[PDB]
Amino acid sequence: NLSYPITPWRFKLSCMPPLSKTTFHCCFRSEQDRNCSLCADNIEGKTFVSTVNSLVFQQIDANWNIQCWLKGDLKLFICYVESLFKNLFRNYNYKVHLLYVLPEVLEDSPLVPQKGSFQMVHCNCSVHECCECLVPVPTAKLNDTLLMCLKITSGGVIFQSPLMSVQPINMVKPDPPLGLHMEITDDGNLKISWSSPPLVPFPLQYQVKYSENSTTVIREADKIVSATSLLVDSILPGSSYEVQVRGKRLDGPGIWSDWSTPRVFTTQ
């Protein structure tokens, strides 16, 4: 009921025609479904909109790319806003505010949150159209349900994104590996070792792309391991091994993590 899972992570948002209280209806254009859910922030915005000005909206295509996710360290929530229209003739000073709430589980009716429940945090926006938000989230509220509704204020005009329901834990994006070393085990195997973050409450599966790459012999192999070290049987002498790792949730779908540094090892 009024809850749509994000499947898949790639979605298209389009606003089409049917001040302080100008409401625009935007919907997600999926391959097989068309869902139009309005945010609960404003419910009494039933105000008439002149059709004459709608033609102006025909000349401006409301296409924006905003990516909000939770980092793998479970410390900061990263929201990136980038404008595809890189025009230097107009540098609009826009402010992005992150409105988030963490309601508790109540067994006495599903009460609707009132106005002002969402916390207002002013992000630090740089001069090159980049805004960084640092929201201190306690570890005790990580297992709760988080609902977000992006709000953009520009010249007295308010734009509200459609409500989305998703668990932030399904898109773990850990820090890039550091202190990782490659060596040859005395038993005759290659160890690539890195120090995984200890703040993750569950084991994380890691897939590494490797391929024996000789002058003629080519052999690309892939395996998924969760330990801090990888065991490969009967490493081949005189071969080049490249290591590149990306993150993904063990259970169900997920979002690929950052592209780590690919490292090359050449055996004699």
Strand 65-70 and strand 100-101: pairing?
unpaired
Neighbours of 102 (CB within 10 A): 14
| Residue 179 CB contacts under 8 Å (≥ 6 apart), including other chains | 194, 195
Taking the C-alpha atoms of residue 56 and residue 197, their distance in angstroms, rounded to an integer, is 51
DSSP for 76-110 reads -EEEEEE-S---TT-----EEE--EE-----SS--
Q: Which amino acid is at 168?
A: P
Read off the tokens for 14: 């389009």
Core vs surface per residue 188-224: b (16+ CB within 10 A) or e = eebebebebeeeeeeebebebebebeeeeeeeeeeee
Taking the C-alpha atoms of residue 20 and residue 158, their distance in angstroms, rounded to an integer, is 7
Maximum C-alpha span of the chain: 79
The alpha carbon of 178 is separated from its chain's Cα centroid by a whole number of angstroms, namely 22
The alpha carbon of 5 is separated from its chain's Cα centroid by a whole number of angstroms, namely 15
Taking the C-alpha atoms of residue 67 and residue 79, their distance in angstroms, rounded to an integer, is 6
Question: Which method, experimentally, gave rise to this model?
Answer: cryo-EM
Breaks in the chain after (C-N > 2.5 angstroms): 18
Q: Is residue 57 within a helix (H) or strand (E), and if so which, with residue range?
A: helix 54-59
DSSP state of 52: T
C-beta of residue 94 within 8 angstroms of C-beta of residue 154: yes
Taking the C-alpha atoms of residue 79 and residue 70, their distance in angstroms, rounded to an integer, is 9
Taking the C-alpha atoms of residue 166 and residue 131, their distance in angstroms, rounded to an integer, is 23
**Of 110, 235, 259, whose CA–CA distance to 175 is shortest?**
259
